């Protein structure tokens, strides 16, 4: 399956001029564009080699669209201050995300369009692409305006149509980087914590895409109660890293197996501690 | 490619 996502952050800056506006575009777990209101270019910029092929018509249009969104969000910061009876003295944040998922056949699976204000859900397009979830009374005002103006109809045309057409174009043009899998390189480490117990840490390195499952078993039974799993983290080269740990009795290391599932593996891996 | 929606909150 595949996704295209855009992420927008708009932050008011009391007494320091215009709000900060940052936009980033992803296909799956690969960033391909950025815009930053504070950068010198004032253009949508490439962040993957495969999007650099797109010509001036693409770059001028994406620049015009991202700057138009920054203008909308500058007004929205003001509107949200009115709805929540907030002064200009405070810094506030609007977050916005939209995009589309497709299946293995590159056919539409679902669409997203949602906003947060100051880290909380504000308004979201429901999964049926025809109705809104308004998280509070402020967001109900927005919801009523968007119902009266038939916003869902025009947004649905983008999410089901245009968004999928872009994703297919990008999946074709970037196929060498976007349609690849890098299977995890795995190893285990051992650390004494007491005289009577030790940590086994199961490592997954250099994998793509980010989606992975690490599971610990004791005698073939999932240990999800007593496993610590760290957030999947970027290596910085376009691949990801993760580890899962368990505390075990010293002398009983070989009762435990680590299980790794990843798109890039024909079969799940099973690791066990080796002196 | 980006959405072209003109809708304000």
């Amino acid at each position: 399956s595949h996704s295209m996502r855009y992420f927008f952050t708009s932050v008011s800056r009391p007494g320091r001029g215009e709000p900060r506006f940052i936009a980033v575009g992803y296909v799956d777990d690969t960033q391909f564009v950025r815009f930053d209101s504070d950068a010198a270019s004032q253009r949508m910029e490439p962040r993957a080699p495969w999007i650099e092929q797109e010509g001036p018509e693409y770059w001028d249009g994406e620049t015009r669209k991202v700057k138009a969104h920054s203008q909308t969000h500058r007004v929205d910061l003001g509107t949200l201050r009115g709805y929540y009876n907030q002064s200009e003295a405070g810094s506030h944040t609007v977050q916005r995300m939209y995009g589309c998922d497709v299946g293995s056949d590159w056919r539409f699976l679902r669409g997203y369009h949602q906003y947060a204000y100051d880290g909380k859900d504000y308004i979201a397009l429901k999964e049926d692409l025809r109705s809104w979830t308004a998280a509070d009374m402020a967001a109900q005002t927005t919801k009523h305006k968007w119902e009266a103006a038939h916003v869902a109809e025009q947004l649905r045309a983008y999410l089901e149509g245009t968004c999928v057409e872009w994703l297919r174009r990008y999946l074709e043009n970037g196929k060498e980087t976007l349609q690849r899998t890098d299977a995890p390189k795995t190893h285990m480490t051992h650390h004494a914590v007491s005289d009577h117990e030790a940590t086994l840490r199961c490592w997954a390195l250099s994998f793509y895409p980010a989606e992975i499952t690490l599971t610990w078993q004791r005698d073939g039974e999932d240990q999800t109660q007593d496993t610590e799993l760290v957030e999947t983290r970027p290596a910085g080269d376009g691949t990801f890293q993760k580890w899962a740990a368990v505390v075990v009795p010293s002398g009983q290391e070989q009762r435990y197996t680590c299980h790794v599932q990843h798109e890039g593996l024909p079969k799940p891996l099973t690791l066990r501690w080796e002196p | 490619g980006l959405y072209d929606g003109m809708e304000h909150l």
Partner: T-cell receptor, first 110, second 110 residues
């Protein structure tokens, strides 16, 4: 009200000045001034995406605009020329669906 | 040039289909509108369309073909009261304003 325009009709001598007033009571961020002449259809003069911002349309030359207040969009003719003889329509939108005012017929004579 | 319509006039007998056609240059355009204008009156929205395909509203059908950059309005069972100028409007890529065609005059003969 929807979208209102004043005046409806005006004759000007070449070199006289006037302001056309567009008002809307719908809380629309977007407002538009057009002219319409036989052969040419509607041509955008200036538009505004919100209070305190304006932008040039297709035929901005000889016209100015202001949007000091969200509810009003003013079109200014500093020095009327016979070429500015036209029907002027203003419009507003919440998104891209435009609602038009009733039009202002202007004739400029020597 | 950005939005093309034939001026007509297009003459059709009462009860025939009227097909009003429009083409546009900007391939990324996301919004398309048909307005009706009676002589001496304001443009009035009759249809909007966003997705490739058909949209029906009483005797009106709009059809959009994005690959051919072609949009149509069909009036079914055309009536003398449909006699008017029909304006095609398109919103280009990243645009915050409509571009109008110069319109097609429809004359529906009783």
């Amino acid at each position: 009200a929807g979208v209102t325009q004043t005046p409806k009709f005006r004759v000007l001598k070449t070199g006289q000045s006037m302001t056309l007033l567009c008002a809307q009571d719908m809380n629309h961020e977007y407002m538009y001034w057009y002219r319409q002449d036989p052969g040419m259809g509607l041509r955008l003069i200036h538009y505004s995406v919100g209070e305190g911002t304006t932008a040039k349309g297709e035929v901005p030359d000889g016209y100015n605009v202001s949007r000091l207040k969200k509810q009003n969009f003013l079109l200014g003719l500093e020095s009327a020329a016979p070429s500015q003889t036209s029907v002027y329509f203003c419009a507003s939108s919440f998104t891209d669906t435009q609602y038009f005012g009733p039009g202002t017929r202007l004739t400029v004579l020597e | 040039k950005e939005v093309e319509q034939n001026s007509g006039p297009l003459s059709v007998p009462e009860g025939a289909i009227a097909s009003l056609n429009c083409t546009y240059s900007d391939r990324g355009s996301q919004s398309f509108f048909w307005y009706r204008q009676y002589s001496g009156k304001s443009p009035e929205l009759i249809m909007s369309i966003y997705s490739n395909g058909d949209k029906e509203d009483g005797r009106f059908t709009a059809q959009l073909n994005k690959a051919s950059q072609y949009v149509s309005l069909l009036i079914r069972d055309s009536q003398p009261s449909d006699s008017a100028t029909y304006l095609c409007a398109v919103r280009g890529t990243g645009r915050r304003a409509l571009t109008f065609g110069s319109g097609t005059r429809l004359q529906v003969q009783p």
